[PDB]
Design a protein around this ligand. Structure first.
Ligand SMILES: *c1cc(O)c(O)cc1N(C)N=O
Lengths: 6, 87
């Protein structure tokens, strides 16, 4: 699953 | 839910303090999946896991791919207005 910390 | 506009204040060195999922290629909005303790989203409040991010500082994120949204979000500095809705 695509998950990004920003 | 109703749309809310929420202001975050980010020191230049820190991130927004959120994790996001979703985007155009996934057939769902950009969604906040995590709020990181002690970081801007957590400190300022008003944002929640499950909120969709419709726009940031006037940039429409409703039809952007995941990576495009990450890039736009990563470029924001200082005082940052999120337009969000609880889905
Ligand atoms: C963020 C963090 C913090 O401690 C205060 O007092 C206020 C903010 N906000 C919402 N800045 O716009």
């Amino acid at each position: 699953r695509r998950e990004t910390q920003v | 839910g109703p749309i809310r506009k929420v202001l975050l204040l980010k020191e230049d060195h820190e991130g927004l303090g959120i994790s996001i999922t979703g985007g155009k290629e996934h057939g769902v909005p950009i969604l906040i999946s995590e709020i990181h303790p002690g970081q801007p989203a957590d400190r300022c409040g008003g944002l929640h896991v499950g909120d969709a991010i419709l726009a940031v500082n006037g940039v429409n994120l409703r039809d952007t791919k995941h990576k495009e949204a990450v890039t736009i979000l990563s470029q924001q500095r200082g005082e940052i207005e999120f337009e969000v809705v609880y889905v």
